């Protein structure tokens, strides 16, 4: 099997993995994965360098983000 983890790249705030320069995507001043760059609420293709973030996980401007950040959450 492959020996060593020669990468020389920043980790991923999604899977805490060594983002490869080949699939390296700069966004919000960080390095994510072409597969990790997917909303968790709407689960729709996002764009690197034009989205919101909360707790490390990305989220569309709204209502995605909006909801997460609001009073009187879903209940009853």
Least CB distance to Zn ion at residue 52 (A): 9
CB 37 within 8 A of CB 44: no
Q: Which is nearer to Zn ion, 24 or 75 (CB)?
A: 24
Distance of closest approach, residue 25 Cβ to Zn ion, in angstroms: 10
Interface with Zn ion (CB under 5 A): 12, 14-15, 33, 36, 39, 41-42, 60, 64
- Is 6 or 52 the residue whose CB approaches Zn ion more closely? 52
55-70 in b/e form (b: 16+ CB < 10 A) is eeebbbeeebbeeeee
- Find the distance separating the first CA and the last CA of the chain, reported in whole Å: 53
Q: Please state the closest distance from residue 4 (CB atom) to Zn ion, in A.
A: 20
């Amino acid at each position: 099997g492959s020996s060593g983890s020669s990468g020389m790249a920043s980790k991923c705030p999604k899977c805490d993995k060594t983002v490869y320069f080949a699939e390296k995507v700069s966004s919000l001043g960080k390095d994510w994965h072409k597969f990790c760059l997917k909303c968790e609420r709407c689960s729709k293709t996002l764009t690197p360098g034009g989205h919101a973030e909360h707790d490390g996980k990305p989220f569309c401007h709204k209502p995605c983000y909006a909801t997460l950040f609001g009073s009187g959450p879903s209940s009853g």
